[PDB]
């Protein structure tokens, strides 16, 4: 077999059997062999084991003659930003993201923060690590501490016109991850009144692991919004490359609708731009992009696909329904900070509440959200669905899984390549009843 910690887009594993200091050091040696010339940026999240894993990575890199730029405790997006800004050969973020206490991981990038993924160097690194029985060498290169965040903060602030911002009251919930540090550094330069929830970085996670998708964690943000009369609420995962929105009623906003909303915000700044989107849920995004004067560009779902498509198209923005938002000016990388700044500016400038903005689109394009189905046989399950609907002659698209467009409703079905699991998304043209009946019908077919 192979080292299980090496996944499609990153390294994720239980410490210490799937990921540990020796493996981290070997990853550093292997990465040094995979990159073009130059220094390597390292950062880490709040997990208790992250600093030691970073130090082991640093040791391997420096034994291989790589200068290391240690940006310290940070969010994943800061490694992306600094790798590109400092014209480094590459970068690694040590993070467990939203995973349990006994897990950690790494996200690896090369020049311009371009992703290193399974088929673009990550499995090459795996195989090198797997065969590496050499004793650790000693450092032949330096480590420099560079914790200044000024360039990163200035970049974030460049997305909004501060003179147009209103003193919105915003709940912010770092979930005891790292987001609060950035909020606090931005705050003196913004007019917002922040209501801080679970704010202090704490890798023991007294309030639960940082994952706003869990209803219990969701409710802490919702309650704070409602109890404080906030304009809206924002929560992040631990490494803050995903953000999650709550309107003034406390309602958690489905991520699909943020793609169209952020496209509107960006296209006001970059008229006529292209916007890349994924194939799961599409109709609202296409309409909002076109009405804002942009050009929507369909792309397969997945980190590397979206970024590569954006690069090839000079797209200003790319978004997935699953809370990943990518920005051309940000080295084509994802940020959990840029999106809420843009939304706060949109609310400030338009006089419309986030709730009103979202509700209107929800009524036009109701969606199921992504529903997962563990199945005995993915191929047989997809076949039951296709067979059932064949007589209706839907328009089919195989860009990513199977999309079927029936006119007034559509679905996308994607199959996992790591386990037998199907993922379903359904939307309709303004018809909640049709949404429910078709969703339940497909659910029955997938299960039976």
Catalytic residue annotation: 97
Q: Stretches 229-237, 277-285, 377-385, 436-444: which one binds Mg ion (CB under 5 A)?
A: 229-237
Compute the least distance from the CB of residue 174 to Mg ion, in Å.
Answer: 13
Judged by CB under 5 A, which of 231, 239, 278, 345 binds Mg ion?
239
Give the residue nearest to Mg ion (CB): 97
Return the sign of the alpha-carbon dihedral for residues 63, 69, 70, 76.
negative
Task: Report in angstroms the alpha-carbon separations of 209 from 18, 141, 271.
Answer: 20, 36, 40
For 91, what's the count of Cα atoms within 13 Å in the CB-facing half-sphere? 30
Residue with smaller CB distance to Mg ion, 84 or 241: 241
Residue with smaller CB distance to Mg ion, 130 or 213: 213
The SS3 call for residue 167 is coil
The SS3 call for residue 23 is helix
Compute the least distance from the CB of residue 237 to Mg ion, in Å.
Answer: 4
Q: Stretches 48-56, 143-151, 186-194, 240-248: which one binds Mg ion (CB under 5 A)?
A: 240-248
Compute the least distance from the CB of residue 108 to Mg ion, in Å.
Answer: 15
Q: How far apart are CA 183 and CA 83, in angstroms?
A: 22
Judged by CB under 5 A, which of 241, 320, 370, 400 binds Mg ion?
241
Give all strands of the β-sheet with 333-334 in edge-to-edge order.
Answer: 295-298, 274-277, 317-320, 324-327, 333-334
Judged by CB under 5 A, which of 20, 64, 97, 117 binds Mg ion?
97
Residues 378-437 that bind Mg ion (CB under 5 A): none
Residue 240 tokens read as 């803050």
What letter would DSSP give residue 252? B
The reply on whether position 237 binds Mg ion by CB under 5 A is yes
Residue with smaller CB distance to Mg ion, 224 or 323: 323
What letter would DSSP give residue 4? T
Residue with smaller CB distance to Mg ion, 231 or 239: 239
How many residues touch Mg ion (CB under 5 A)? Answer: 4
Helices 255-267, 354-364: inter-axial angle, 10-degree rounding: 110
Residue with smaller CB distance to Mg ion, 241 or 308: 241
Compute the least distance from the CB of residue 128 to Mg ion, in Å.
Answer: 26
For strand 90-94 and strand 103-109, is the pairing parallel, antiparallel, or unpaired?
Answer: antiparallel
Compute the least distance from the CB of residue 107 to Mg ion, in Å.
Answer: 9
Nearest to 272 by CA among 259, 285, 290, 260: 290
Provide the binding-site residues for Mg ion, judged by CB under 5 A: 97, 237, 239, 241
């Amino acid at each position: 077999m192979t080292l299980p910690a090496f996944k499609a887009y990153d390294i994720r594993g239980r410490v210490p059997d799937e990921l540990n200091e020796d493996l981290a050091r070997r990853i550093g040696v292997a990465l040094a062999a995979q990159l073009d010339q130059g220094p390597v940026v390292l950062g880490h999240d709040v997990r208790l084991a992250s600093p030691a894993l970073q130090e082991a990575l640093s040791a391997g890199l420096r034994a291989s003659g790589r200068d290391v730029i240690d940006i310290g405790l940070c969010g994943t997006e800061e490694v992306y930003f600094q790798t590109d800004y400092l014209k480094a050969a590459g970068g690694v973020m040590v993070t467990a993201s939203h995973n349990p206490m006994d897990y950690n991981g790494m996200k690896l990038v090369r020049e311009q923060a371009r992703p290193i993924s399974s088929d673009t160097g990550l499995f090459a690194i795996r195989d090198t690590v797997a065969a590496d029985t050499a004793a650790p060498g000693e450092p032949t290169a330096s480590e420099q501490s560079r914790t200044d965040k000024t360039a990163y903060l200035e970049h974030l602030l460049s997305y909004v016109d501060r003179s147009t911002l209103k003193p919105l009251k915003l709940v912010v919930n770092a979930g005891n991850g790292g987001a609060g540090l950035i909020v606090d550094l931005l705050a003196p330069h913004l007019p917002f009144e922040f209501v801080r929830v679970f704010h202090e970085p704490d890798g023991n996670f007294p309030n639960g692991i940082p994952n706003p998708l869990l209803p219990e964690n969701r409710d802490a943000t919702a309650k704070a919004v409602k109890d404080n009369g906030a304009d809206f609420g924002i929560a992040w995962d631990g490494d803050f490359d995903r953000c999650f929105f709550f309107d003034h009623t406390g309602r958690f906003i489905e991520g699909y609708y943020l793609v169209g909303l952020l496209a509107q915000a960006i296209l006001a700044k970059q008229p006529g731009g292209k916007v890349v989107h994924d194939p799961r849920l599409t109709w609202n995004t296409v309409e909002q992009v076109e009405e804002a004067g942009g050009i929507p560009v369909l792309c397969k779902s997945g980190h590397a696909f979206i970024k590569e498509k954006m690069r090839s198209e000079n797209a200003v923005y790319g978004g997935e329904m699953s809370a990943h938002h990518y920005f051309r000016e940000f080295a084509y990388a994802d940020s959990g900070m840029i999106p809420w700044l843009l939304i706060a500016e949109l609310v400030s400038q338009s006089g419309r509440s986030l709730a009103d903005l979202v509700e209107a689109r929800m009524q036009k394009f109701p969606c199921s959200g992504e529903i997962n189905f563990k199945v005995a046989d993915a191929k047989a399950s997809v076949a039951r669905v296709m067979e059932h609907y064949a007589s209706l002659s839907p328009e089919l698209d195989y860009t990513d899984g199977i999309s079927a467009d029936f006119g007034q409703w559509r679905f996308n079905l994607r199959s996992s390549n790591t386990e037998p699991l199907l993922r379903l998304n359904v939307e309709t043209r303004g018809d909640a009843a049709l949404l429910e009946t078709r969703t339940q019908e497909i659910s029955n077919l997938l299960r039976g």
